[PDB]
Assembly symmetry: C2
Homo-oligomer: 646 residues x 2
């Protein structure tokens, strides 16, 4: 089909000029051709392109999991915007896109069969400031801090004043900050592990007396007092930032069949890639991670991939994720709480978490289901179809008659709702906007939080991924109408063929946040965890709450560093019909199962070495153990309990 080259609309490769106006003109041309029925490629002759926010498209938008209703951030600048169109591929052809200030890099709204491919994404001055403590001198009370080339600063006594680049149009500085930015997390240059410590206390900026420029991108800080934190800082990168998610990194809203492939995300400001009310998104060969040509380490200001209230198939494939400041992937919807029963067929529901509000979670024709918050179980026979929606449209206007509030949506339903549905005790899930999820052949590393969060009732496959060094659970499946109000329950989860290394916590945590644990129904159903390799070092493999038909089979559990310290490998809390079979365990791990809110009759270990209600410490295999005559023998009984240590 047709090719639209940005060079024909004012944007030369490697020009040092602002390409934002030319890109708008190229997109306008592409949409003209697409409206005639053509398949269009917007091509970027390979090179660097700078994209500034000043003249970029501006839209009022309410974006899941960012800033909720906050009027100070409701307007977004968007570097490349495909709006109300179809059949357009943005082909960077290997170009490097450099964005400026605070803005969204690219976005598609109300569009179908759109693709973004083959470019890198970066910011001139990233809004996460990565400072590495290269050496500390407790005697002189100094610290030598490496400041990457990208950042601009002015020294003023004991103060350092950070600033971005400036607008070419007005000379205004896009942003400034002073000394320690609000949040900091820790990347150990030695181990490659990223963790959250005390995120609100940066030891670089504690008791500073003066700063001097030692040249070659190094500063020397001087301190009145030498705290223990600072004394141990050698080799630690302190990655600091504001936490306001003022823009999504990428926004895919009310689209259908979106593809992102072959994109190198070297830095995303504000948030990650946000899919919202979109049918089918494919993410293939994405690399979230700083390049070779930078001393920076942060690639994400927050999460990498957020798929909120989507449907169709969400695919994440052949991609890598390194150093976000929050979870790499979260696929979820939003529970809204019943706050008024207007009639048997009409209810007002409310966004209860202050970072998710202001956009539609319901359209006419969608199906919804009601849940009781306390046990997080569905109301029997509570599926209804939406026949009218009055509330925010996500752009500052009204759907239907509107609701008068960015947090409230009035729904009319096709028949009377169950009489038990009441204000505050019940929430509503849009069950039409639940996606199938296929996350396979990816690499997750340098992550302080969880690896993957996924909560959908459709088919979930998490397969052949490597999780290396997740600071919290590798995979986390919740379902929550307590703090986060993220739906929904799972019905078909397969976790297969993954490897878990250097787990900072449980490898797999299933923890819906219901305070009431039902002993007769479960929140989640039909979960299979098979063929995985778990390297363990004192944390659990599986900690699962309120799952029925849970199978853990044919996995391999190895000690990472090959009376007994560490947790039993397994914990089950209010589960039903649990089956263990065919797993292999290294000698010396606690292949045992802690039980909460349930008895042993619901756990079948007849085909496995794991022990219910005991340590299950795995002894040497066979009837004869070969032991050095200078080593001690710990005798292990048939439940995996040590009886004596010589």
């Amino acid at each position: 089909g047709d090719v639209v080259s940005v060079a024909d609309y004012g944007a030369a490769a490697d020009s040092g000029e602002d390409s934002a106006p030319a890109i708008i003109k190229a997109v306008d041309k592409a949409k003209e051709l697409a409206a005639e029925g053509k398949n269009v490629t917007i091509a970027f002759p390979k090179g660097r392109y700078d994209i500034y926010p000043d003249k970029a498209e501006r839209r009022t938008l309410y974006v899941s999991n960012t800033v909720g209703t906050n009027s100070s951030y409701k307007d977004k600048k968007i570097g490349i915007l495909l709006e109300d169109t179809k059949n357009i591929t943005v082909d960077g052809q290997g170009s490097d896109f450099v964005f400026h200030g605070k803005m969204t890099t690219f976005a598609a709204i109300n569009s179908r069969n759109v693709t973004f491919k083959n470019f890198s994404v970066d910011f001139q001055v990233p809004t996460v400031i990565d400072l590495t403590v290269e050496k500390v001198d407790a005697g002189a009370k100094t610290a030598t801090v490496y400041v990457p080339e990208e950042y601009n600063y002015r020294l003023s006594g004991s103060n350092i004043e950070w600033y971005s680049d400036s607008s070419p149009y007005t000379g205004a500085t896009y942003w400034t900050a002073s000394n320690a930015l609000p949040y900091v997390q820790l990347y150990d240059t030695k181990t490659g592990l990223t963790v959250r410590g005390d995120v609100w206390t940066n030891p670089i900026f504690q008791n500073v007396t003066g700063i001097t420029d030692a040249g070659n991108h190094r500063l020397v800080f001087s301190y009145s007092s030498m705290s223990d934190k600072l004394a141990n800082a050698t080799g630690i990168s302190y990655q600091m930032r504001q936490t306001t998610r003022d823009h999504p990194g990428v926004f895919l809203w009310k689209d259908k069949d979106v593809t992102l492939k072959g994109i190198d995300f070297r830095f995303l400001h504000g948030f990650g890639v946000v899919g919202q009310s979109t049918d089918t998104i494919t993410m293939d060969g994405l690399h979230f991670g700083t390049g070779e040509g930078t001393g920076r380490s942060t690639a994400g200001y927050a999460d990498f991939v957020q798929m909120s209230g989507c449907k169709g198939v969400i695919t994440v494939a052949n991609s890598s994720f390194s150093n976000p400041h929050d979870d790499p992937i979260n696929v979820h919807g939003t529970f809204l709480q019943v706050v008024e029963k207007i009639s048997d067929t009409k209810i007002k529901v409310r966004y209860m978490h202050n970072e998710t509000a202001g956009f539609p979670s319901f359209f006419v024709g969608d199906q919804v289901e009601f849940m009781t918050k306390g046990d997080m179980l569905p109301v029997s026979d509570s599926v209804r179809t939406v026949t009218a929606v009055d509330g925010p449209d996500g752009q500052g206007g009204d759907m239907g008659a509107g609701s008068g509030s960015l947090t409230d949506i009035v729904l009319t339903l096709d028949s009377a709702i169950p009489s038990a549905v009441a204000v505050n005790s019940h929430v509503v899930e849009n069950i039409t906007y639940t996606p199938e999820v296929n996350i396979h052949d990816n690499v997750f590393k340098e992550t302080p939080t969880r690896g993957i969060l996924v909560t959908t009732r459709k088919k979930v496959t998490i397969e052949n991924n490597l999780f290396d060094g997740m600071g919290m659970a590798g995979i986390y499946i919740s379902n929550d109408a307590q703090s986060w109000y993220e739906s929904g329950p799972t019905r078909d989860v397969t976790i297969r063929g993954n490897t878990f290394r250097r787990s900072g916590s449980d490898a797999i945590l299933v923890e819906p946040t219901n305070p009431t644990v039902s002993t007769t129904d479960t929140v989640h159903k039909n979960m299979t965890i098979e063929g995985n390799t778990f390297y363990v070092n004192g944390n659990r493999v599986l900690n699962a709450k309120s799952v029925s038909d849970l199978t853990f089979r044919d996995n391999k559990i190895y000690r990472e560093n090959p009376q007994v310290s560490g947790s039993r490998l397994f914990r089950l809390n209010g589960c039903k019909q649990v089956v263990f079979g065919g797993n292999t365990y290294d000698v010396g791990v606690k292949a045992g199962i802690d039980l909460a809110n349930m008895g042993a009759s619901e756990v079948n270990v007849s085909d496995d070495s794991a022990k219910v209600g005991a340590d299950g410490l795995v002894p040497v295999t066979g009837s004869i153990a070969y032991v050095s005559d200078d080593a001690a023998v710990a005798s292990v009984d048939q439940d995996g309990t040590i009886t004596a240590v010589g």
Copy 2:
């Protein structure tokens, strides 16, 4: 009956002279008459009697829960010893006995129907040193410390040197120490609560730069800096001591029908009242606590009452317990571990904890039962009778052939032991030496640890007691072959009509220490908790592990401070229990009448006749269909499971 007066053997009441020799002479006379079949009273004309260790009876003795085999402490001085006799009553007639140095106060060994009554027990210089920080001055970096009159000290430099009184025979001081003794616990004079903090770090004695005598029993300590601990020390009494239990406070070994009554224990050195392999001990009207005529606060160097491997009936009645340095009461036996199967009818068993060893836990004719340590369950059909014993006799000699070790006993059994019994995996309990227990109408306060420990298969009744301020569980029922090796499983426990106030932890904790939670049989059986009152403030009422036939009924649960998602624990936790019934309990508004479950499902728990909720908070809402709420208070809406659904402000 005949009377033997200590005043006829050289004792002079209120003389300050050593009465130990006169007491020995008087006991020798009483034993003569007792052997003639007479019922004898040994009488003390009312007054103060001083009893020194120098000329007191000395006995090699191995004493449960003190120092085990340690040869440095095997010999005990005993102020009043009834040995190998019967039908003797020591009647103090209201006298005050003051002991000196480090010694056991009184003891009865291998004696029948003996009584001690009607005296107070104290030490000239107690071996617990109670120091009260009365004032702190952060700017001056000083603390003003009250030192009770009873203690002797000298200051040298920034050091304080403690010393006892001196022997009247040799002139030598019985003991000395400097600065902080090894262990300290905290009595808050404001609240009456006693706790353990960092017991190995005394803030009075960190960073001291000077000590000044300020007169009237006060010292001013000066410091190079003021730690947060010391800054907040005002009104806290720091009760410090060594921990070596070199003597039992009282020792009742191999007796039958012993009575202690109307005794005021103002201070016991070394350990508490120890019953050991004794059949029936009655304790009635005992008051463990410092009197009103001292500034001291510690009454016990460690525990108050230890009944180790006894049988018959153990009664503790009408008594009070204030400020020990360990649990007021522990009734238990000792598990010994199988360490050698010599034949199908002969085994060697071993004392595994280093503070309990060197004495017999088995006698010919006793019955024993075998347990698997992992799940702490009995081995089926494993009750056997002892036909021979080779091991320590408790005073440094051999029973039978001996065993060659103070920790090891060789038992011969009447028939072959079960074949599943093996070395190390199995332990033995003497089930003959398991007592009935009746603890009633007592008061427990000012206690940093647990109130009552009891592990016996015989009938247990804990009834109409007051527990106020226990730092740890009020009642603790374990059964342990893991660290402490204290037996045994319970079969008939009733906890009735008690009141628990200011509970530092769970009110009642049942926690055998089996690492394996058997899914079939329970460690404990038949436990009824009824008619008690629990004042609660965020801790649990009942935390029970591995009990079958557990009934919690007709109790009253009140909020301790009736002015105030939700903080505090659910009131109940059950771990591997069976056939549990809750019924007829009453709960104040705002308590979490909910039940946490571990290693068990909800169908084991019958709450049909109760408000408690399984697997939910069970927060108790305002009673009735109308709630009267101030229009400046918020409403928290509570669902049927006791879970909060919303918190308003707008009603």
